[PDB]
Symmetry: C10
């Protein structure tokens, strides 16, 4: 569906990030230079940006 | 030729923000050799898309 | 569908500032292999939280 | 000598934003050796294009 | 209702002071060999201490 | 001698934007050894040239 | 408990004068590292000079 | 090589122009194998050319 | 420790030393197989230019 | 205990802009060993010097 997020919906997604509920996909080494995809928790720097945006709203 | 309109810009930003998009990056396959693969758009990029959608 | 209220933003920033949070990172385990682990949030990120708390 | 006009700039940013453009990068093929290859334009760059498109 | 902790203005300054006075550490990954790492704590860096000092100067 | 004037600036940015230019980069040839080679101008740099062309 | 303006300037001065150190990781071979102290960098000392000049 | 020369306005723009037109190079370190490096010259990068162009447009 | 505060004039004298190429900074230098030693190197151009920028504004 | 005069700032900036200055860097000589060497000041730094001279 063609969807445009409205203001409250932006804040709901930002809230999930801030609360530590989201992950992101990165490459992880598995030996000798080979890598696999994996998910990690979203980093503090990103959570803080989400909080900073929430606090401005 | 296509110029994306203001609403079209917000729709693409939304796809990104909602985690529906990928980007192509290089992944190690061993001994320095790499291959092209797709990964999810990173949180930092999603947060940028959210930030712009909040300014809409 | 939660939206963090003003107080709740500051409470979260406080947890970070006070050194109570961690972040998940990749740590080398030899010859290119890595494992996920948690490390304390960095001083740079804590100081940003402190700066935000000082403005509030 | 050509100068890209207003509408032309937006046409080019649109191709980028839509995921239709590539860039040439260096990819490993083993033991330090690299080859030139094309990859999709990254999400960060698409986001910049979408931002510029949204502000015109 | 349980009122969770929000750091107060004086307390932000007290934490920044600890940092600026060189009394704080952060956890980093340190190399131990062959691509392997271990966790250790290091003194907060001069760059971070200067950011703290700057914020203290303005407060 | 030559000072580029405003239109000449826009002509050069136009070449960059249209993907007609290259830059010289160091490419790996094995075991740390490198060679000077040329690759297309990157999307980030093309987008900067587009941004500048749109502001004119 | 809280550094006041003058103590801030004293601390920035120490840094600007090249009297301060910071802890960093130094290689000791084969990927291993040890913690050591190094003089605070020129970039940092210049930031401190900049803040001192605006005092 | 006069050590006390000061560039005039038009000489600044002449120098930026040489950069923009791809006439200049910079000295960088290039790998020659097993960690050994040599000094070499490369063309000025597109990023630096674009900054020179931007400056010329701001004149 | 022996406390001191730099005055406006001392700020400029120390920037001038940097800008004139008279100062050094400590860095780590490789000595082989990943091992490093401390060494002193001249202050970099980028840092001398920032000093010159500040001196120019004063 | 010199303080650079305004003209002396510009003279120094001019040396850099004209390609006459060098900076000291570390250069690999093999197996991880490095040596101090001098290289020309980079284009990015020459361009900054140019920008500052242009504002004078």
């Amino acid at each position: 569906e063609k969807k445009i997020l409205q203001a409250n919906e932006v804040l709901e997604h930002l809230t999930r990030i801030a609360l530590g509920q989201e992950k992101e996909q990165v490459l992880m080494g598995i030996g000798k230079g080979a890598e696999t995809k994996t998910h990690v928790e979203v980093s503090a720097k990103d959570r803080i940006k989400a909080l900073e945006l929430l606090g401005k709203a």
